[PDB]
Amino acid sequence: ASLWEQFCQWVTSTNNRIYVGWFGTLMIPTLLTATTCFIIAFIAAPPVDIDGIREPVAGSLLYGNNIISGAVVPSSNAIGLHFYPIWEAASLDEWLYNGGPYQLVVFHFLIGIFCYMGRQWELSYRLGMRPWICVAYSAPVSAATAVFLIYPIGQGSFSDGMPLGISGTFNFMIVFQAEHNILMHPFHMLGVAGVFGGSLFSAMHGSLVTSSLVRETTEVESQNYGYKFGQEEETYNIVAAHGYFGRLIFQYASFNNSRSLHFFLGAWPVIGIWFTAMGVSTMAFNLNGFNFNQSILDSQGRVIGTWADVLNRANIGFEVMHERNAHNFPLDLA
Amino acid sequence: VTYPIFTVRWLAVHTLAVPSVFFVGAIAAMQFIQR
Amino acid sequence: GGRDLPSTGFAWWSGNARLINLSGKLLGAHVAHAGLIVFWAGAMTLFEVAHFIPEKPMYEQGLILLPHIATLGWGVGPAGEVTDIFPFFVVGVLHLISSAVLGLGGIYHALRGPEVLEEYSSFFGYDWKDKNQMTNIIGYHLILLGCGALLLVFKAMFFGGVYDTWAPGGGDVRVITNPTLNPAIIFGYLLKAPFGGEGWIISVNNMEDIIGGHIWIGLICISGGIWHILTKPFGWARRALIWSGEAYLSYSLGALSLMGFIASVFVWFNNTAYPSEFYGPTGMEASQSQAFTFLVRDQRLGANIASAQGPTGLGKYLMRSPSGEIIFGGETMRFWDFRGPWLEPLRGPNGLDLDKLRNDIQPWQVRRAAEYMTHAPLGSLNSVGGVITDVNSFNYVSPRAWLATSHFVLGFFFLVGHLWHAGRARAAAAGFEKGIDRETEPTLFMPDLD
Amino acid sequence: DWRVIVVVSPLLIAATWAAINIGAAAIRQLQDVL
Amino acid sequence: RGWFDVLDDWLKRDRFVFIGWSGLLLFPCAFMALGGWLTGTTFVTSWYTHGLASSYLEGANFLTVAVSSPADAFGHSLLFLWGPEAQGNLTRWFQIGGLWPFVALHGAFGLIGFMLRQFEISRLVGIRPYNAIAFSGPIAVFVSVFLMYPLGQSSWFFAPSFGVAGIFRFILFLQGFHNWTLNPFHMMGVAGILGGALLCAIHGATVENTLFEDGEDSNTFRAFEPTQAEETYSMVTANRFWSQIFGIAFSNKRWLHFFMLFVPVTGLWMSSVGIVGLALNLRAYDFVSQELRAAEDPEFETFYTKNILLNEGMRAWMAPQDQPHENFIFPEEVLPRGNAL
Amino acid sequence: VELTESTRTIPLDEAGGTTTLTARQFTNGQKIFVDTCTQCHLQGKTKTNNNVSLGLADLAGAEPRRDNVLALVEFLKNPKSYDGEDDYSELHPNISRPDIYPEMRNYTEDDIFDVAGYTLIAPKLDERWGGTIYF
Amino acid sequence: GTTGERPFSDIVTSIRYWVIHSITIPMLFIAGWLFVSTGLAYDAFGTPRPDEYFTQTRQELPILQERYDINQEIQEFN
């Protein structure tokens, strides 16, 4: 009726090709801003003094990077955790030199992904669905927040956020392992179980459904054409799949309830990723992985090495080389 | 009612559980070794 | 109410959902759980007292509750030396006994007390849709919360004071005689940017501000309590909110997630409400301490630390912040917003002052910097102190690390719980939390997207 | 080695206990299956 | 009835643990591999092969025990208990790392037996054998990593040790010496694994949140029956949701589940190809253009070059302890390191 | 090998003196070291000033030499600069200043003797003792 | 749905199972215990005791170097 009411019905409309919604009213601008700035910076940003030592790092394609080595470089260590929008730079060149694009892209991206999760809830509400797809999506959101915001907060600088690049990601991981022994952190082990097991369960579920497909096609056409979109009947024989799997391992380890099976499929990777996100978020406060360096002594008192000691040697090798000009004092506390 | 006692399932159970309990006893004892 | 799946519709693993409409049983669950909280407070306090070596610093002994009591001004003197161990014991004993009482009451209500309270009393009986009654319970609890804030104020002002790490002559328990009631300061804290150098409310740095803000909080809470006792929700609130038990739970979950995140940040950064005397240095404090320690050492060796340039060309010991302030050099440049009682005496209007650095450094500052540098909040999960590549002989993890990590994790999972319950409350209010109705599946009546 | 004897004797004792408490039914089952 | 048919009947009886013909290979080999790992991690040292304690008996824990690879002196000898090295001496066989090939070979034949079991049970119950095809991925990983990589290298010593920290050591070794993260085949493996986890999560959640109202309980789990003919969740609603949220959506259930098979399996196969490359030191170690520019331009710095520096540090600091048979003596002054660290 | 008497045998004073810790003396010295010294002496280093480590060469280079147990106990009573010119009783923990070092006020002369003996024995069990901070 | 075997819950809730197993299970437990605590495991598997990692003549890691005569190599390592 009223103009505002009409606008409300448009934004919350389920007939839009892309659902907008109220969370979308924030998601779309912030995500577009982040995407445009990211593309521009990745192509053409000038080098960024990430470590705050006047040692600029070239991240963009036009300054000699390929796709693998290119990145949007985290803002300068001199900035620390200070807010550095464009309007606090003396010029655009200064803003670029100090890594302002990283802050712009990251802040907009984070707002965008939280609004994406809210938008998932919103559309589920408009369509009469159950509301918990956004809960599953909260796992990747938690991980991204850990690596882009929480870890820089705990470490005290956005220069210690994950770079927006492939090789930058690897650098982040290697330094992280050198400083926190993330491999020996049980939450990262749970994350590995989450992703290995999620892939395992994806492979099993897909293979068991594909294995039990009901015959509806000929040997020529794709078996995919045996399923018609919106058909009421089941397209595979879950009882045959259960018979096969319960004989592969044993009867009582096999799901015969599709609903319990799909809940398990949702829950395993999501929980694993929640745990690994919390692992990164707590290593942000330097509660690190297990330290068994020199845990085994012989009777005299000489250290007997274990694989943990070899791992520590690798960590030290990474530790002494990283950011080779940035440290003045013996302990890497910052 | 009145099932067999020993089966393939019995053997599968014991083949695992028996050395498992033995090994657990060994590791428990290791918990008290002094250097 | 039923106690199984057929008669409730809830499995055992969601069994507490069976309590949603059994107000007496729900009250019992809450009271017993409160008993659990108070029991942990008392038992952990007694454990910490028993495992307390009172001449060693609190933060060296894995203590998280005793620092809370010490900050309140009980059992400590200047620099945080533990004078009397008895008050800690008393706090623990009182919590333990009261937990016994609370557990007795929670068990009574959960097991034998009336199932529902509405046909027993209008005052205690409630319906989730009864907006006036829900706001009444809000009002009562707001009055209580304001009273607790005023209890903090009364302890700081009339009952021996609180520990002030910024006290002249050394950090000491002191009585706060002039809390800042000026609403400009108090509520301008809420407007400060949550970024480096501003620190939205984490930057509160003097007990006068803390006590004055608590006076304001007490007044706000009590007045809001009265306001909610005497009114009902307005039309806009009624049209905007879901009015159900699970909805109220989800609202509280969101609030708790926010508070958990805030507390983790607060303990990580703030050294006023969390004095380093009891909680150890912040990470920023330890980094700055290392820079100071080597400035002092090298200066004693004869280095002219004002003019010594490092390998990159920046000053090794001193440099400028991006706004020009004189700050410690090295990686600790990121931590130049740090303020601490041991370092501010060497700070001039422009930042670190060369004259003070060259002739005003006291031996106690050197000792404090060495201690803070060597107790940096870095440690392994199995409590091996120092950087992760260090060897096993230093058993230390900062209490700040424990508190910050734990409460960030709890904040995150309570955000997850808020999402879960908010979505469920919406779906249940709209009536599709049990799945899509085949007859009236909404998408079947929608135009195709393309 | 005496260590062998004392490490084996518990295993043997478990064997005889199980035998003396299951043997009637075990021989019943063995005979039934021929 | 011939004796072969009688045996076939007995092997394929419906019992709690199906045996089958494949069981003749699977169960003894799998039991050997598992018991060998358990025995080695509980009792067996790596003192003579690696100079490391690797068993509970020596004081190591779950994270630090391993069946360590054999000594580098043996090259790729299969290290049979009766072989020329151990010569039938069980104690010596344990001490030289004979348990590692024991576990690796018995595990390889156990994996073969398990996939043959997948084929056999699929054939018996009358379904398509796509589970075995999916299992080919883990087999490719095991073959490449535990056999082909050490076979291309100097010896079994450089195979991953069967242990948690042993695997971590192998991972960091491959980063520092091979720059394995830079390898495009590894990146396709990572894409496949993370995509498989994503598909698992998103499919499970989508199904659970588009369920039909088929019962009256808040507990939606018992509104399903395995013999029911109709779909338990709304594919149409799921498709509309994902089309409006993400832009695109599955509309074919069969393609969806084949994709859930396809993604992680292809990831495993691509990563195995990359590992085969690393077996011959055919690495994606460097970008020569950036190396040359950095060598002539001391102001050119990228994340790639920083990672190269990290690898150099790891190699120099790790090699003397990781490769004790080499007797690497790197004096303190030759170790690379940044300032103050 | 065992933690033999020779391993526990350490120089007692500068005039060639020699003492042997008992296993209990060594274990209490280790316990005290881990409790109060490892703070800035992990693995025989000195986190706050690694020019002056606990390595045998640094200990023997001090004035007077501190690689014997009496010199170590004396330093722990009255700490001095490495050339024995500056009084560090305000700057290094010592039993003589319980007012500023309370972490040490409960230690006996036997305890200081034990920790000094451990400081002399630990270097021969660990080649990394007294090395570089990252080493 | 039972493949023929007795259900586990029935077996493990029965008195006879527990009369058997309150003996069998502890005996294997203390058999493994005695395996460790008598020193049998050290000698059987060749694992060094805490005082035998190094000898009064070998202070270095006894890394095997010879391709075929490891028995003599280990003996000279002691």
Ligand code: CLA
């Ligand atoms: C004050 C906070 C609060 C309250 C009152 C509730 C209340 C409720 N929740 Mg809920 N929830 C919360 C927070 C809360 N939740 C948070 C923070 C999360 C995110 C994880 C959730 C996620 C959640 C889900 C997914 C569900 C509920 C459900 C429910 C209802 C029934 C739950 C039940 O019976 O418990 C049963 C208790 C158990 C089954 C035991 C769980 C043990 C957990 C998983 C591990 C504990 C770890 C802990 C840290 C200790 C570590 C132990 C270690 C030593 C090994 C109930 C009304 C159900 C519902 O929706 O009802 C309609 C339901 O499906 N909640």
Ligand code: CLA
């Ligand atoms: C803080 C944790 C907590 C609390 C306070 C409650 C409370 C409650 N639950 Mg519950 N629940 C929980 C966790 C909790 N639950 C978890 C983790 C699960 C998953 C396993 C469940 C699953 C569950 C189900 C399936 C059901 C409940 C139900 C109930 C209610 C009825 C209790 C009852 O009759 O059982 C009786 C139990 C007993 C009589 C055993 C003894 C219990 C007492 C209290 C033990 C106290 C011992 C203590 C040390 C003694 C000190 C006494 C004094 C001297 C201090 C009740 C209010 C029921 C309900 O909803 O009612 C409608 C219901 O059906 N819960």
Ligand code: CLA
């Ligand atoms: C928030 C917690 C809480 C709430 C809302 C209730 C509510 C109720 N209780 Mg319960 N109870 C509790 C905790 C609670 N109880 C605890 C911890 C115990 C163990 C001691 C009990 C033991 C108990 C028994 C045995 C009985 C009840 C009964 C009742 C019902 C009647 C109340 C009444 O009119 O009596 C009168 C109320 C008063 C005379 C007011 C007295 C207020 C207290 C006792 C004085 C202290 C006030 C204090 C200063 C305020 C702050 C508290 C402080 C700790 C911060 C009512 C629904 C009765 C019932 O169910 O009827 C059949 C019943 O028989 N309760």
Ligand code: CLA
């Ligand atoms: C736990 C304590 C508590 C709780 C649960 C409530 C709950 C409620 N109050 Mg409230 N209130 C309280 C304390 C509390 N109050 C106190 C202490 C006071 C005294 C100051 C008041 C004074 C008050 C008034 C005047 C009114 C309420 C009203 C309400 C009802 C609806 C308001 C609403 O939607 O909230 C949410 C708020 C909004 C939807 C407005 C948006 C606010 C901004 C835009 C959100 C941005 C927050 C930001 C992200 C956080 C940054 C922190 C800081 C920097 C600002 C609701 C049931 C309304 C009512 O119906 O009265 C009967 C109402 O008119 N209260």
Ligand SMILES: CC1=C(/C=C/C(C)=C/C=C/C(C)=C/C=C/C=C(C)/C=C/C=C(C)/C=C/C2=C(C)CCCC2(C)C)C(C)(C)CCC1
């Ligand atoms: C409901 C329910 C539940 C819950 C319950 C609860 C939650 C509870 C509780 C409870 C409680 C919460 C309790 C308590 C208690 C306490 C006590 C009982 C005490 C005491 C005391 C004492 C005795 C002390 C003593 C001492 C002293 C005096 C000092 C010195 C030291 C000592 C310690 C000795 C459940 C889940 C189970 C389930 C069922 C239902």
Ligand SMILES: CC1=C(/C=C/C(C)=C/C=C/C(C)=C/C=C/C=C(C)/C=C/C=C(C)/C=C/C2=C(C)CCCC2(C)C)C(C)(C)CCC1
């Ligand atoms: C004590 C203290 C202080 C003080 C403080 C204060 C005074 C405070 C406060 C505070 C406050 C006073 C607050 C608040 C808050 C708010 C919130 C948190 C909100 C919100 C919101 C919401 C939640 C909403 C929602 C919604 C929307 C969005 C729309 C639609 C509807 C709804 C409802 C859904 C100081 C710092 C000075 C000092 C220290 C201590």
Ligand SMILES: CC1=C(/C=C/C(C)=C/C=C/C(C)=C/C=C/C=C(C)/C=C/C=C(C)/C=C/C2=C(C)CCCC2(C)C)C(C)(C)CCC1
């Ligand atoms: C070597 C060898 C062999 C083989 C052997 C065998 C085959 C055996 C075995 C064995 C075995 C087969 C053993 C076992 C074991 C075990 C164990 C050691 C266990 C364990 C466990 C645990 C520790 C668990 C725990 C838990 C968890 C964690 C979860 C839940 C709860 C429970 C408790 C379950 C022969 C002589 C032929 C030849 C030569 C070489």
Ligand SMILES: CCCCCCCCCCCCO[C@@H]1O[C@H](CO)[C@@H](O[C@H]2O[C@H](CO)[C@@H](O)[C@H](O)[C@H]2O)[C@H](O)[C@H]1O
């Ligand atoms: C599916 C197939 C599985 C294959 C593996 C199954 C287990 C196979 C184990 C075979 C073990 C071979 O073990 C080998 O036995 C021979 C014969 O006794 C021993 O030989 C020993 O006795 C013989 C005669 O009695 C002497 O000539 C010889 O000098 C002496 O060493 C070897 O020292 C031992 O190494």
Ligand SMILES: CCCCCCCCCCCCO[C@@H]1O[C@H](CO)[C@@H](O[C@H]2O[C@H](CO)[C@@H](O)[C@H](O)[C@H]2O)[C@H](O)[C@H]1O
């Ligand atoms: C769970 C199973 C645990 C594994 C087994 C645990 C027991 C370990 C067995 C060690 C037994 C004695 O171990 C010692 O080495 C082997 C055992 O093969 C024997 O070795 C001897 O016999 C073999 C076999 O013919 C020949 O190579 C040769 O004659 C000689 O080496 C030694 O004479 C024995 O002293």
Ligand SMILES: [Ca+2]
């Ligand atoms: Ca100390």
Ligand SMILES: [Cl-]
């Ligand atoms: Cl780096």
Ligand SMILES: [Cl-]
């Ligand atoms: Cl530095």
